[PDB]
């Protein structure tokens, strides 16, 4: 349970960073 938990948390963070930059790129098109 511990390894799968660590792995899913790291994936969540990297997905969240990806999303934050995609939203920043979108903000360049709309405001």
Torsion of CA 9, 15, 18, 19, to 10 degrees: -120
Residue 15, helix vs strand vs coil:
helix
Q: How far is the CB of 14 from a copy of itself (least distance, A)?
A: 9
What is the x/- site pattern for Cl ion, positions 7-26, by CB under 5 A? Answer: -x-xx---x-xx-xxx--x-
Size of the site for a copy of itself (CB under 8 A): 22
Q: Give the N- to C-terminal CA distance of the chain in Å, as an integer.
A: 42
- Of the residues 8, 9, 11, 14, which one makes contact with K ion according to CB under 5 A: 8
* Positions in the binding site for Cl ion (CB under 5 A): 1, 8, 10-11, 15, 17-18, 20-22, 25
């Amino acid at each position: 349970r511990m390894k799968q938990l660590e792995d899913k948390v790291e994936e969540l963070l990297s997905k969240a960073y990806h999303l934050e930059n995609e939203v920043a790129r979108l903000k360049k098109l709309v405001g």
